[PDB]
Design an enzyme around this catalytic site. Sequence first.
Site, short mmCIF file in Angstrom:
data_model
loop_
_atom_site.label_atom_id
_atom_site.label_comp_id
_atom_site.label_asym_id
_atom_site.label_seq_id
_atom_site.Cartn_x
_atom_site.Cartn_y
_atom_site.Cartn_z
N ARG A 536 30.82 -20.50 35.22
CA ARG A 536 31.69 -21.54 34.67
C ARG A 536 33.15 -21.09 34.66
O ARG A 536 33.41 -19.91 34.45
CB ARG A 536 31.20 -21.96 33.29
CG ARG A 536 29.93 -22.79 33.25
CD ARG A 536 30.07 -24.15 33.93
NE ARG A 536 31.04 -24.97 33.19
CZ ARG A 536 30.74 -25.86 32.26
NH1 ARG A 536 29.50 -26.12 31.90
NH2 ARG A 536 31.72 -26.53 31.65
N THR A 643 24.15 -13.25 33.30
CA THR A 643 22.83 -13.28 33.93
C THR A 643 23.00 -13.47 35.45
O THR A 643 22.18 -13.06 36.28
CB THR A 643 21.86 -14.39 33.48
OG1 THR A 643 22.57 -15.62 33.33
CG2 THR A 643 21.18 -14.04 32.17
N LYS A 647 21.17 -11.78 38.99
CA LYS A 647 20.75 -12.49 40.18
C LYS A 647 21.32 -11.84 41.45
O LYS A 647 20.68 -11.65 42.49
CB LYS A 647 21.24 -13.96 40.12
CG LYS A 647 20.58 -14.79 39.02
CD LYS A 647 21.27 -16.15 38.82
CE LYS A 647 21.10 -16.57 37.36
NZ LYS A 647 21.76 -17.89 37.11
#
Lengths: 803, 803
Positions: A536, A643, A647
């Site tokens: 974001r 997070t 990934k």
Amino acid sequence: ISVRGLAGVENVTELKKNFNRHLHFTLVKDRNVATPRDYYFALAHTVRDHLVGRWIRTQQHYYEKDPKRIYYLSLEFYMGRTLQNTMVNLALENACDEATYQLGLDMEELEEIEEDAGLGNGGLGRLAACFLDSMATLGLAAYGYGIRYEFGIFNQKICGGWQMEEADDWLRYGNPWEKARPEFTLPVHFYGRVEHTSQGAKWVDTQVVLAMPYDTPVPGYRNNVVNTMRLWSAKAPGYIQAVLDRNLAENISRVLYPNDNFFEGKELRLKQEYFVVAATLQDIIRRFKSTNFDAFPDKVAIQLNDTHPSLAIPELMRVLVDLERLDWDKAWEVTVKTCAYTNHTVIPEALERWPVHLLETLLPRHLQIIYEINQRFLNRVAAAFPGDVDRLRRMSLVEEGAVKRINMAHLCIAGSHAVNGVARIHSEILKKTIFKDFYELEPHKFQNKTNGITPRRWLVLCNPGLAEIIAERIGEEYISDLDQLRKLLSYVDDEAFIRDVAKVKQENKLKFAAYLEREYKVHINPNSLFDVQVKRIHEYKRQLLNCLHVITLYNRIKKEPNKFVVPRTVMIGGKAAPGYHMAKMIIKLITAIGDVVNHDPVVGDRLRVIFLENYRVSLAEKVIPAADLSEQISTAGTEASGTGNMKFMLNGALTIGTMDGANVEMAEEAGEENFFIFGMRVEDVDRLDQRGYNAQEYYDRIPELRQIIEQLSSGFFSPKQPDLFKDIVNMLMHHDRFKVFADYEEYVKCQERVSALYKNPREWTRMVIRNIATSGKFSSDRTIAQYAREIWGVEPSRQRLPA
Amino acid sequence: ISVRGLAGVENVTELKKNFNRHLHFTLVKDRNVATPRDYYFALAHTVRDHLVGRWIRTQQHYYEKDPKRIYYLSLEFYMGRTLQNTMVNLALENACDEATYQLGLDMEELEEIEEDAGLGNGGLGRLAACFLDSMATLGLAAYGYGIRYEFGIFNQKICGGWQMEEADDWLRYGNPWEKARPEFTLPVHFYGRVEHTSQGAKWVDTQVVLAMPYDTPVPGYRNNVVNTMRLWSAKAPGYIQAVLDRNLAENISRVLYPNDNFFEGKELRLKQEYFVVAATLQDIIRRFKSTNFDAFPDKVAIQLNDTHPSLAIPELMRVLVDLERLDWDKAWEVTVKTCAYTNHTVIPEALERWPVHLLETLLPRHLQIIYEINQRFLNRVAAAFPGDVDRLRRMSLVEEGAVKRINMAHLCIAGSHAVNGVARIHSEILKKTIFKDFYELEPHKFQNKTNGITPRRWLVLCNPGLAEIIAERIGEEYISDLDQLRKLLSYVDDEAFIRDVAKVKQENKLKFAAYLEREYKVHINPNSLFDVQVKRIHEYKRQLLNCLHVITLYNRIKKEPNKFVVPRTVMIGGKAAPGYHMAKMIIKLITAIGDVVNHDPVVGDRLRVIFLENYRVSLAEKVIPAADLSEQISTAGTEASGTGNMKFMLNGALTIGTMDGANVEMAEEAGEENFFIFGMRVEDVDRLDQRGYNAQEYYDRIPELRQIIEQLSSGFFSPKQPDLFKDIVNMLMHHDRFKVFADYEEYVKCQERVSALYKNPREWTRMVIRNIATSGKFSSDRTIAQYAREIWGVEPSRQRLPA
């Protein structure tokens, strides 16, 4: 790919039969008018049928067995697409691929029709989604509970280099995975008043909103466990206007608030919170009933994802005292043992502090219960720290000021037997700063649960080639036991494995480049380092520091055009909350940098800067597997865990980042030499805060930085509106809370080391293998096993249910 | 019952299999938690599967064959329940009964779960529903087109003797019969303005509302024809409010306006009208395209049900001229040959006359097209009747006054090649009064199409015993050829048939009495004449005249308590439009009469007056088959046709009514001696109007009437609020437009003759047989065959499609 399973002859025959059956009877289509959309739907219905027996059997098993039940309450579930995930967990992927191929269809083309179920803003929403998967894979009787927003996170369009928002009508063509359950619709109450009689208090004269549940199946990995996600939808309980006015009640589940790490005290949001909490807790009490309340905490665990559902604490007390007639003390012992709270950030504007007037109008009985909770908690504080009057003021659930407010984090700690942070550095900072007074009162309540991601979605689904070359050497057990990836350190010097890792990465980059060309018509150089920052848009994540680097590369190229530089494609993507001016100006700066950089003939294909539109879960599955370099550059102390970092690590990218959030543990797992750590540590950020951050000192000492600010201020990246980035410049020079300039020098030097290693592909690939191999700790199965054993009191299991 | 078909062994086996399959996979239920509702749904899905192949084959046949297509445009489709109807038309009733019985279930109990699809107010809505059925039974390529209201006609509750309205949430548990078709969603435009360029006019700057179609199957009787009903649903094309504001567009299909024979110039209603018309006509043009426009009227017929969809005329011109580039003249010849209009009432307040300002804001281009239409039509009037200036003023589409308006009936006549009334007396009055100027201009345009009802729903479905004793003597062909009922005149003297008719009626009365006891807890005497008036509440239908009779019976009983009278149960039911004060006061008078009459120990079970709550299509199927006497007592000249009268006649009730609407043709068919005709004829109503209706003359000359008005005025039927019916009394005495008092004497005398015949059951039953036997003309198959041959230009057929 062998990890995609078997294409049995009878199974393929049956799948084709059921595909054609659904096309006919369910869709009321035929092959002369069917579109790809119709074929996606016939496959979705065929696949959904395979979950049904399993789903009924699992829920029956939990009833017969009576395990402790886990209720995961969240205002967000960012699930993404479900078709491929369902196939993977049921081992149907190759069979469906074959079945559809035999029908003349391309299954991956069909998968692209499905809309993301975008019921989350970012990290916290997606964590809830990974957790549901891991809880099903670990055989826990776990129930995800939330709200079925009609519109999820808006669809971002880029127009003239700026973000535009469009409503995300994710339900237009229907949701084949959910099952409406109108028969189990329940009443939720608002406003009204409290009558104090001889039967205690009574909440009367309320307005009712109905909560209609929609259940979605959540399949475990090859264990035949199918859990449930229950999402509530709002329904209304002269004449024409009264019928049109039913939308006022139904507006509660209309749209997800699109903020990220930011609290806006909207009454509608407060209703959303209470609506989820009240309907979920009626379900919980009814299931429990089907002597008693003493054992409630032995059969119920309520997990609060952030303070969003913190009204469950006062709601549980309200039900137990006012409706079940328990004495306050027994009810409070029950409530504390049932509830546990997970904190997701220390950033002050993220904290929920509701005006007491608002809580008083909307939920009069809850406010009464909150004040009694506070009085009793503050009596325990005074007895433990006698005469410490400032502590009482600081710990109180009630915040003073012009507008008195209720601190929802303080309510959560007071009413929970466990409080946890989401990364080691973050859990420690909670105990040392933010919740230090609470930690001193009850040390045992404070835990850490480092976040994780599911390796099903984030490795098998999104990077089948990677999953396959791994399985070729160590088998398939690692898919539900990710710590087995450590076996891959045996292949750091293996020429076949080094070759295959690098080939898989190149195929993913080609696949990503084809997607961008086809869908957004953007051309990128496949033989360029793919440098990616997707998350974001927020000042704390420092997309602006990436912008400064990018402009530094362009300016260096222009200064010395004949000098060789590692070719790069810098890609930045992410949504800006509507109304966050600076975030919106940052998106426009990224696109504006590209407008100059991408059209300069001297640069050519040596440097390209692109803004990736509509970053969302399904885009993440495409771009992360293609990335070479993972940007995780938040100011130390600001990203609780992250997070996306995990990934990237699992998918073969190397990381450039600060010692923040779970980056610290990732670097610890892989060995710090296998990471590109730069910049201020938390201690350095504090020392700067102690003496005062002066951005002018950096500008005066750094000629290259000075050059960039002068281009921005003078209008070099906005020729037709020279003062356009005047606000970005002002904040950087004078009101930069996240100290971009302070990390500029070390970030650029670090980026040079990234390029130097990329020029030696063999050694880049070897360092990648050392990252993939140590990414095991970051599986959400590990995280969930820790919640289960250290908080919920349940033992996780991989034992299969009958086939 | 043999008319319910065969319960084949393999078919029953398959039905059970599919029931269980749907329970499992579609409902995600099992037999331990399933309710009757779950079992109704599993049966509904099983039955719906039988329509699918037929539905696809029919639509393909129409494409291959290319017949002329019939578009039936209506703002109302009052369909009722669909499960039993589907079974009847597919010959699956006995098989499903057996299949469900073998599963331990009662199929009639399951049928009671289904909500009526109540998308109509009364007659006109239900006519559209009967017409769809008959058009499918007659093999016509007919498309019903309307709006999918979220809320149909409100559910009426009676509280304290008064009507209360509740929203009819008919879609709560879903609609298993419809198929959403979001892929075929189309754009509808509003507001904007007209630009006149060099390509003619251009409607720009409009606001868009999307029209999403939902298709429902409409099965013919045993011919394997399955037609379609397409219903449009409205969808929207800082940030939070913009998403919440999507409800403004979606409010177009939210609720049916609950008026009956009454025009309210609401802008929202105008949007509903245009929304249906614009989306339907895009479908029509696209299907047509798949040289051309000359043949458009050979391949398209647009039927306007009332003036509600009259905007189709200007919309068709708009599309043909502005978008298809046809010259005005060719376009107008096309439009007139495609369109035909059905008028449903002569009552002045029913007529649609939209303010020109409103049409100018909302639909600027349509208003322009309307004025040009008017100018050209008025030029033809002047050329045909030179110097007749008053005719021009009277015929004009534009009405003068403080607010100029567009007369939608005048637009319809000007733009249609056929105009029809719905009963012989009504079509004649159109030509002689209301549309006399238009009739003189174009005599050939004016037709009659006497209404009808489908004998599938209104005889086989609702009165299986009746259908069976008929089929025992003449076979089953009459179900799709109702004129074969004339064969029953052979049995007027047949002792077995006389016995069975009377027994069927008694079983229906027992079945109705059990329903009332069970569902509304009302007790009625089964051995009483069932005197029924069910229809919408309106002054013209004269529920108040029934009230005067009822009170006359009570007062006569009290005057002479020892005198024997034929026991009666007087039942009145029907909805009042919310906001129609007098209608609402009439419902309260009916309940108040019952409050006195039903509790008087002298009366006991000799006279009972009950208000039947929530009269609707499914109630009609229960009460009509149980009725002995059918009340059809509208002031002569006010009920255009009526259709409830026809239902009663087909189901074994005798009729008491005025020479109005289709009552005249019913009495003509059966022989006037087999009907109970009373009161003023249209000529008498006119003579009274000519000299002035003075209700005081009747009060002064009739002592019994005087007694009733004094009880009402004095508070005899409202002891706790003596002046409660002061308004009913005032209207009757001074402003009664429908002349109740003028028919009082003859109505009471007629009612005495009804009782006299009821005392001789043999002769009552013989007169019933003469009514049932001549009810054949009133089948909607006859009506639809007349529309097809005299207006649409298509030949109806009973030939079956391949099994």
